[PDB]
Every structure is written in C-alpha cells, then in structure tokens.
Amino acid sequence: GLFASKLFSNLFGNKEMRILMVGLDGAGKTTVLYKLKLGEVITTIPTIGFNVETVQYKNISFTVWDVGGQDRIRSLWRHYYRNTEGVIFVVDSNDRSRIGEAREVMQRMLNEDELRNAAWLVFANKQDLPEAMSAAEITEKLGLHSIRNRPWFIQATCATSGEGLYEGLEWLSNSLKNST
Numbered sequence: 001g002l003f004a005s006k007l008f009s010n011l012f013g014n015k016e017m018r019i020l021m022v023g024l025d026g027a028g029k030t031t032v033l034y035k036l037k038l039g040e041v042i043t044t045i046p047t048i049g050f051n052v053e054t055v056q057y058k059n060i061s062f063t064v065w066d067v068g069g070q071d072r073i074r075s076l077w078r079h080y081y082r083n084t085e086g087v088i089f090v091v092d093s094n095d096r097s098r099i100g101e102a103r104e105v106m107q108r109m110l111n112e113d114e115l116r117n118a119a120w121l122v123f124a125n126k127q128d129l130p131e132a133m134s135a136a137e138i139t140e141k142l143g144l145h146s147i148r149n150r151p152w153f154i155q156a157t158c159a160t161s162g163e164g165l166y167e168g169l170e171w172l173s174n175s176l177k178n179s180t
C-alpha cells in the first residue's frame with residue numbers, strides 16, 4: 001500500500017484475493033515470478049513429478065504453475081482452485097503456433113463454476129520482440145473476442161524491459177479496488 005511512502009494509496013479492498021499464474025508453459029511465468037519478488041518461497045509436489053510453487057503476502061496469496069493437455073491433474077490443484085481468488089492468464093506473444101493451446105487451456109479453466117466469479121486477466125509477454133503478436137491480434141487470435149465482455153481484460157507487455165508490466169498490475173489493482 002505504502003512502501004517507502006512514495007504516494008498515498010487508496011486500496012482498502014480485502015475480500016479474499018489469491019492471484020495465480022495459469023496458462024501455457026514458457027508463457028513467461030519465470031520472468032513474472034521474479035517480478036512479484038516471491039513472498040513465501042514454498043516448494044511442494046502434488047503427485048508423481050509435478051512442480052508447484054506457493055507464496056503468501058500478508059493477506060493476498062499467490063501460486064504459479066503450468067498447464068496443458070499433455071499435462072496431468074490431481075486433487076491438489078482442485079483444492080487451491082476454489083481457494084484461489086485471482087485468475088491471471090499469461091501467454092507467449094511470440095508463440096502463435098501454441099496460442100491455440102493456451103486458448104484451450106483457458107477455455108477449460110474458465111469453465112470452472114467455482115471460478116465463474118473470479119477476476120480474469122490476460123497478459124501478453126514478449127511485446128519487445130519485433131516479430132511478436134500485438135494484444136489486438138492476440139486478443140482476436142486466442143478467441144478473447146469469443147468470451148463475453150467483462151470476464152477478462154487484455155494487455156500487451158514485455159517481461160524483459162518491464163514495459164507494460166507496471167501499468168498492467170496498477171490497472172488490475174484498480175479493478176480489484178472497486179468491488180461491485
């Protein structure tokens with residue numbers, strides 16, 4: 001809220017919020033993870049050979065993990081699923097060949113009745129690349145237009161230069177600050 005003062009904030013919301021990173025592998029969770037600083041460094045395994053990370057920040061929780069068809073599932077992802085209160089989808093702007101893969105994963109994920117009331121956000125990571133897709137083309141490409149209006153928002157960014165990352169969270173914070 002404050003952090004070295006800087007500027008008087010107004011965020012007073014706290015109606016349960018837990019932002020997790022969902023999407024295709026290599027989308028840019030590694031770069032974004034470091035950006036979040038990583039509150040409580042926790043390393044656990046749901047089953048067989050699945051690597052999941054969990055961190056806690058005061059009240060807001062955060063969890064990162066990849067997803068895909070070839071990927072399996074268990075009962076650990078479900079437990080945290082409902083408990084989760086923040087759904088943020090991040091795809092690769094330079095991986096068009098897999099953009100559909102991200103859409104499908106998002107399609108099945110968004111079909112969770114327990115997540116029907118969760119805030120959904122899309123982030124494009126790799127806008128610094130000269131051959132990277134734009135949020136507009138990405139939005140239409142991933143069928144972002146196919147989803148009802150209000151569910152999620154889309155924004156292009158570059159994980160390397162940090163351009164778009166700050167404005168993306170700041171904006172997201174406002175939406176989370178004003179609850180209907």
Ligand SMILES: Nc1nc2c(ncn2[C@@H]2O[C@H](COP(=O)(O)OP(=O)(O)O)[C@@H](O)[C@H]2O)c(=O)[nH]1
Nearest residue numbers: 025026027028029030031125126129158159160
């Ligand atoms: N050009 C470019 N490369 C990026 C960007 N973000 C991440 N990368 C690189 O793309 C690869 C995948 O990033 P990563 O965050 O590890 O994806 P993850 O496997 O989903 O965590 C790494 O080599 C990153 O350095 C970006 O915005 N632009």
